[PDB]
Amino acid sequence: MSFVKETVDKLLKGYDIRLRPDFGGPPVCVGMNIDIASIDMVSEVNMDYTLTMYFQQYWRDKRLAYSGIPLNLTLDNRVADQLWVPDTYFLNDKKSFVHGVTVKNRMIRLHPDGTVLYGLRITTTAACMMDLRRYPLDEQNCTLEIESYGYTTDDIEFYWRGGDKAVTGVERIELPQFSIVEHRLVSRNVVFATGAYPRLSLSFRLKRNIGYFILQTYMPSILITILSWVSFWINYDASAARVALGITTVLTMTTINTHLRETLPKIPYVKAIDMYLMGCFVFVFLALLEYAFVNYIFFGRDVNAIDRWSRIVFPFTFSLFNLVYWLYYV
Amino acid sequence: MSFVKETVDKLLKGYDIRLRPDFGGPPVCVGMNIDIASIDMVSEVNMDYTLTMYFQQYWRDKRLAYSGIPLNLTLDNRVADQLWVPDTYFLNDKKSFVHGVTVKNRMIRLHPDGTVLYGLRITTTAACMMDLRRYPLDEQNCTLEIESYGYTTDDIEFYWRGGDKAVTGVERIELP
Amino acid sequence: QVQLVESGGLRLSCAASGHTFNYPIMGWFRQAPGKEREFVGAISWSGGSTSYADSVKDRFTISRDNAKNTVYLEMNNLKPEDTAVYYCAAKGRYSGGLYYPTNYDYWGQGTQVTV
Amino acid sequence: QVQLVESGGGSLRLSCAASGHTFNYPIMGWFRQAPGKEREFVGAISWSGGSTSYADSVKDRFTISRDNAKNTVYLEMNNLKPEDTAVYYCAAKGRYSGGLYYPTNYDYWGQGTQVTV
Amino acid sequence: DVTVILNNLLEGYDNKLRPDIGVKPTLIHTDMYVNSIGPVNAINMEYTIDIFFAQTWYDRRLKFNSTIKVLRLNSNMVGKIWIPDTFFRNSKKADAHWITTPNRMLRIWNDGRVLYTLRLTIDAECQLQLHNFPMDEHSCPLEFSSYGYPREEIVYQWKRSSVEVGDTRSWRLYQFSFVGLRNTTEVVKTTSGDYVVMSVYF
Ligand SMILES: *[C@@H]1O[C@H](CO)[C@@H](O[C@@H]2O[C@H](CO)[C@@H](O[C@@H]3O[C@H](CO[C@H]4O[C@H](CO[C@H]5O[C@H](CO)[C@@H](O)[C@H](O)[C@@H]5O)[C@@H](O)[C@H](O[C@H]5O[C@H](CO)[C@@H](O)[C@H](O)[C@@H]5O)[C@@H]4O)[C@@H](O)[C@H](O[C@H]4O[C@H](CO)[C@@H](O)[C@H](O)[C@@H]4O)[C@@H]3O)[C@H](O)[C@H]2NC(C)=O)[C@H](O)[C@H]1NC(C)=O
Ligand SMILES: *[C@@H]1O[C@H](CO)[C@@H](O[C@@H]2O[C@H](CO)[C@@H](O[C@@H]3O[C@H](CO[C@H]4O[C@H](CO)[C@@H](O)[C@H](O[C@H]5O[C@H](CO)[C@@H](O)[C@H](O)[C@@H]5O)[C@@H]4O)[C@@H](O)[C@H](O[C@H]4O[C@H](CO)[C@@H](O)[C@H](O)[C@@H]4O)[C@@H]3O)[C@H](O)[C@H]2NC(C)=O)[C@H](O)[C@H]1NC(C)=O
Ligand SMILES: *[C@@H]1O[C@H](CO)[C@@H](O[C@@H]2O[C@H](CO)[C@@H](O[C@@H]3O[C@H](CO[C@H]4O[C@H](CO)[C@@H](O)[C@H](O)[C@@H]4O)[C@@H](O)[C@H](O[C@H]4O[C@H](CO)[C@@H](O)[C@H](O)[C@@H]4O)[C@@H]3O)[C@H](O)[C@H]2NC(C)=O)[C@H](O)[C@H]1NC(C)=O
Ligand SMILES: *[C@@H]1O[C@H](CO)[C@@H](O[C@@H]2O[C@H](CO)[C@@H](O[C@@H]3O[C@H](CO)[C@@H](O)[C@H](O)[C@@H]3O)[C@H](O)[C@H]2NC(C)=O)[C@H](O)[C@H]1NC(C)=O
Ligand SMILES: *[C@@H]1O[C@H](CO)[C@@H](O[C@@H]2O[C@H](CO)[C@@H](O)[C@H](O)[C@H]2NC(C)=O)[C@H](O)[C@H]1NC(C)=O
Ligand SMILES: *[C@@H]1O[C@H](CO)[C@@H](O)[C@H](O)[C@H]1NC(C)=O
Ligand SMILES: CCCCCCCCCC
Ligand SMILES: CCCCCCCCCC
Ligand SMILES: CCCCCCCCCC
User: Any idea which positions bind benzamidine (chain B)?
Assistant: First the structure.
């Protein structure tokens, strides 16, 4: 107890934070581990995802070695300022924090051989590019890039501790709309003309679940188009009925397209859902134009030929359009 | 070159930050100046409006009086924590802050006669009650009220430095 | 409130009944005679997100179905070190540590797979 | 600006009618000035018509109402005492003026009516 | 060795005063690397930008003669040194990064050259003339200057070749397309004095 206190005092005495371990020696090797609690949210509008996690950095330092105390020491969180820590930052971070209730989620653990382990609970809102061109049938690939700020590869070398076992909690992630297909870890050195800087990267591939979209966005449009096709089987002189059917189908299509504001209106890009809705709109418009032709040709100046070929060509053309769309986008 | 260092050290030596200029004398007279950078939004829902400004205060302090240096000294902004400043505040603000990138957007400037210029970059959300009965044919009057917190007119007085030209940028402001 | 029944022995199937959402991650352990239970592979609740032990990688595979039958296991490369009874277990959402049996609450039974 | 006009002057009802930019000066206050004595704060009323505030002397005797449909404030009096003989004024106050009991904070005043009992 | 140099250089050096306070203006060479221009939030008339901003100046008080000439300082000493008061005029809510550690690097050479680099994520204001919407083009500025020091005290200069931009494909611009950039420098007149305002238009 007392001798433990004097051991800690001797360890911290004459230890300059401004000096890295082996200032003139070979570079210090930092092993990084992550235990990710969950990915809290993924927003396409702001183009980013929120990740909470336990970042651990492990490194050796001869200055902080002790002896005669075989048990492993876990010092208080207030020693972080007293001890030197590597400068590490997330390149694609927009806003992150270290939890601070009831106390700061920060741990420093020393070992008798001078080794140090530093752990932090961080919630980072990292930013990842998204290709919402194939939305909602897309498959995003988001990344977290860890990099040293001041030091080059000649002074600090980042690596994954445990190879492919560095990152854990992918099973623990549970996103409502997305589903994780694969995760990857890549360590490398970004090469600059001035020098080389180390970098690590943890990447996730996130497929999107399409059952919800197929139920809400796609199915009503198909049903409305099929309803618009009903006009061809009604008597050609039923002007009020056929015109009301066609124009109300057009109105329903427009109503769906406008209150579809849930599906990414705030940021505007041409996605795949937009093309599908446009195709359905064009089909119902052509359906009404067909009765326009029928009325003018046959009423003014034994089924009529226009309806006869329309009944066969409208479903066939819509099926071909659907086949082309699904094959191209999948 | 060390003369400036000795002068500022002598000025800051034995300086009481809790005592206003002329504590027992007549009240200190403070001029104010504003440059409106932008009126960001004017929300009818919340009946408030955000406003960014450069807010500057001028006051004469005999304690910070020097000689032999014919130039106005612009010191580091951290000296504001050592010097006395007015306890000004916006009475109708709902939320406000001083911008802090790259450093604190603050400025202290001294003059040989003793004048002190104190500038801040402030974004503030002020309250503006609105008579929306005639909406959208309405006309609103949104005010910003500046007042001393603790001191009274027996200790501190305010004025618009430069008179009617004490506020600028209003012609440059654009709103949707 | 998670009744687990494992069957099979090679293909194994572990059916779960009850409040299965509260116990998302489910995995497999094996106990040889005169040995402790050792981890064999775990699978998450949603879709394909699984982990495997290095000692038995690429010879045991785990898949999931959104049904009461729940998870399936596929076995290859029978060896004298596979003479162990295999248990199916489920874990709480926040009970960290996949490889440790003590973190798991509700277990199935042992299926001997002796060569 | 706002133009105030007091009228009226034992059920007595005084009326202070306001015209102009009445919204910018929501609070309206009634004062009284007897001969010799200085102005005293009789009462105050808000914009919405609620949260009326009366002085200690006449807290229960008088009652002040409001109706923004015509921009007029009514000061009713139930029982009048012979110390109440005075010139009654109406005034308007800004939204960030200050206290209610001090006539200096009030910007626009009225000519004031006379009451004797 | 290095530590004794560190405690030696601090002695004296009142940080309140700029280098060459009474002699000449302090010349600051600025460089900027635009990581990406975030989405242009037209609803609030703003756009997010991520930059690595470096500025270099000369301080004669910090000269030290020793075997090392590439010395580096912990962020705490960065706060004991004088640094310029540069700020972005059109910023709405800008901020540097701090996790895992404060992202600020200060490197001093033996000849008194000081280089200070910061990573910034600014939300700069960009007024939009939406009369020609959706057939519109905009020139969003990012302008900065010293807050307190006029032209007679601090003078900014672009280091070389304006600013460097990464690969445009990595940028998060979905509603708009990038059509290049340009740089400008002027002397904006204000009540406090004349200030050298640098600007980059995208
Ligand atoms: C948006 O809406 C707001 C809503 O309020 C609206 O605000 C009002 O704006 C008007 C102007 O349009 C303001 O009116 C002016 O107020 C001046 C200050 O009045 C106070 O101080 C007077 C004394 O002088 C002060 O200043 C001198 C130095 O200049 C100083 O030495 C003094 O110590 C003092 O600080 C004071 O008289 C006045 O009134 C009180 O006292 C008088 C005494 O007779 C009494 O009659 C009053 O009842 C009251 O108790 C007050 O305390 C004022 O100087 C100025 O005067 C003009 O007219 C006079 C003649 O009438 C001229 O002599 C003078 O040169 C000026 O031309 C004027 O009255 C008003 O105060 C605002 N109200 C509030 C609450 O802020 C905005 O205008 C609207 N604007 C927009 C853009 O929409
Ligand atoms: C909301 O949703 C959450 C999500 O899961 C629910 O969470 C769980 O609640 C139940 C309710 O009790 C918890 O059950 C218990 O666990 C405790 C603690 O167990 C540990 O420590 C004990 C210390 O004495 C130890 O004995 C235990 O050993 C057992 O477990 C091991 C596991 O392998 C087993 O091998 C042993 O044989 C033991 O069985 C264990 O290490 C335990 O004390 C509780 O005991 C009660 O129930 C048992 C069985 O009926 C009974 O015998 C006891 O006498 C006692 O009455 C109980 O088993 C469970 O741990 C929670 N899970 C998590 C992940 O937190 C929650 O219940 C839901 N609530 C509501 C309101 O919806
Ligand atoms: C989401 O999308 C991102 C962006 O594309 C993907 O990121 C890339 O991932 C791949 C691997 O999946 C990375 O490629 C790898 O780099 C490794 C290290 O390169 C070293 O070697 C080079 C050349 O010598 C050095 O310059 C560098 O500094 C490193 O020292 C390679 O070892 C990998 O190997 C494959 O190619 C090499 C040839 O180069 C073969 O010899 C190998 O046998 C092997 O076949 C690979 O090349 C790539 O660098 C990553 N890019 C970025 C920007 O991070 C994510 O993977 C993706 N995620 C998902 C889940 O899809
Ligand atoms: C230190 O600060 C003083 C001011 O406190 C500086 O002197 C002042 O300079 C301004 C001009 O920058 C003078 O203002 C006006 O200038 C216009 C012309 O530009 C003129 O038309 C006006 O009549 C007016 O003079 C100002 O009067 C003057 N001083 C005063 C009395 O305010 C001074 O230059 C600064 N620097 C030094 C080195 O002293
Ligand atoms: C202090 O921490 C060290 C770090 O692991 C512990 O040491 C190792 O201990 C584990 C399990 O106890 C072994 O599997 C490793 O082989 C050990 N060596 C290495 C290099 O990791 C150590 O036991 C801890 N001290 C205690 C428990 O008193
Ligand atoms: C930008 O600034 C640099 C440096 O001052 C200058 O050389 C160049 O001409 C300017 N314009 C462009 C388009 O780069
Ligand atoms: C979906 C288009 C309308 C279906 C008409 C059914 C015709 C039945 C012919 C026997
Ligand atoms: C809207 C166009 C309708 C055209 C009606 C038919 C034109 C004449 C066909 C011979
Ligand atoms: C499962 C996806 C179905 C896509 C629509 C099918 C169209 C059928 C046309 C009659």
Answer: 87-89, 147-149
Query: Would an 8 Å CB–CB cutoff place D98 in contact with chain B?
Result: no
Question: What gap in Å lies between CA A89 and CA A124, rounded to an integer?
Answer: 11
Where do the DSSP E strands lie in D1-117? Answer: 2-7, 12-20, 27-33, 40-45, 53-54, 62-67, 72-77, 86-93, 108-109, 113-115
Ligand-binding site membership of B171 (annotated): no
What's the resolution in A? 3.1
b/e sequence A120-141, b meaning 16+ C-beta within 10 Å:
bbbbbbbbbbbebeebbbbebe
Q: Which of A127, A158, A140 is nearest to A34 (CA)?
A: A158
Indicate the top mutation candidate among A60, A69, A72, A74 to test ligand 5's pocket, ranked by most ligand atoms within 8 A of CB.
A72
A306-310 contacts at long range (C-beta below 8 A, 24 or more positions apart): A307/A232, A307/A233, A307/A236, A310/A232
Q: Do A171 and C47 touch (CB under 8 A)?
A: no
Q: What angle do CA A9, A10, A11 make, to 5 degrees?
A: 90
Q: Report DSSP letters for E18-74, one per residue.
A: PTTTTTSPEEEEEEEEEEEEEEEETTTTEEEEEEEEEEEEE-GGG---SS--SEEE-
- Tokens linked to A84: 């030197």
Residue C66, chain A, CB below 8 Å: the answer is no
Technique employed here was cryo-EM
Q: What is the DSSP letter of A68?
A: S
Q: From A98, which residue of chain E is nearest by alpha-carbon distance?
A: E99
DSSP line for B69-124: --S-EEE-GGGGGTS----EEETTEEEEEE--SSS-SEEEEE-TTSEEEEEEEEEE
Interchain CB distance below 8 Å, A89 and E99? yes
The label of the residue with tokens 């939890």 reads A99
Q: Are E95 and A96 in contact (CB under 8 A)?
A: no
- The answer to whether D90 and D4 are in contact (CB under 8 A) is yes
Secondary structure letter of residue A220 according to DSSP: H
As beta bridge partners, residue C88 has C28
C45 in A contact zone (CB under 8 Å): yes
- Chains in contact with E, where contact requires at least 3 CB pairs less than 8 Å apart: A, B
CB of A328 shorter than 6 A to ligand 8: no
B5, B100, B176 ranked by CB distance to E14: nearest: B5
Breaks (C-N over 2.5 A) in chain E follow: none
Determine if residue B149 is labeled as part of a ligand binding site. Answer: yes
Token pair 């990595």: residue: E170
Q: Are A253 and A224 in contact (CB under 8 A)?
A: yes
What is the Cα–Cα distance from D48 to D42, expressed in whole angstroms?
19
**Where in E94-172 does DSSP place strands (E)?**
95-96, 104-108, 113-125, 141-146, 154-158, 164-165
Distance, in Å, from the CA atom of A240 to the CA atom of B80, rounded to the nearest integer, reads: 81
Q: Are E30 and E164 in contact (CB under 8 A)?
A: no
Q: Is D23 on the interface with B (CB under 8 A)?
A: yes
Identify the residue whose tokens are 């190879």: A163
The atom of ligand 1 lying closest to the CA of D97 is 75
Determine whether the interchain pair E3/A122 forms a contact, defined as Cβ–Cβ distance below 8 Å.
no
Q: What are the angstrom distances between the C-alpha of A58 and each of A31, A103, A159?
A: 5, 22, 10
Q: What residues of A are in contact with residue C49 (Cβ under 8 Å)?
A: 170-171, 173, 180
Ligand lying closest to the C-alpha of residue A315: 9
DSSP C51-96: EE-GGGTTTEEEEE-SSSS-EEEEE-S--GGG-SEEEEEEE-SS--
C-alpha separations of B45 from B49, B127, B128, B130, B138 in Å? 10, 11, 11, 10, 15
The whole-angstrom separation of Cα A55 and Cα E100 is 9
A197 in a labelled binding site: no
CB A187 within 8 A of CB A202: no
Residues 6+ apart with CB under 8 A from D44: D27, D28, D29, D30, D52, D53, D64, D93, D100
Phi, psi of E83 (to 5 degrees): -135, 155
Residue B161 Cα to ligand 4 midpoint, Å, equals: 14
